Amino acid sequence: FVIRGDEVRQIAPGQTGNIADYNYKLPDDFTGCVIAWNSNKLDSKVSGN
């Protein structure tokens, strides 16, 4: 998926906030990896996406 830069820290077990609570929740005993990289060159519109 695609999220904002400030909210990337909400993608972690036990976290709380707008994204973690209402959009995407991770289990407490989660195992795996999360990869996030900036994509300002592909998902940005001057008019606005």
Partner 1 sequence: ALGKLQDVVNHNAQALNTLVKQLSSKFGAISSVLNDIFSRLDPPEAEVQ
Cβ proximity of 15 and 9 under 8 Å: yes
Size, binding site for partner 1 by CB under 8 A: 4
Cα angle value 7/8/14 (rounded, 5°):
90
Between residue 12 and residue 31, which ones bind partner 1 under the rule CB under 8 A?
13-15, 28
Q: Considering the complex, what minimum distance in angstroms separates the CB of residue 14 from partner 1?
A: 4
Cα angle value 42/44/10 (rounded, 5°):
90
Of residues 30 and 38, the one with the C-beta less far from partner 1: 30
Q: Which stretches of the chain bind partner 1, using CB under 8 A?
A: 13-15, 28
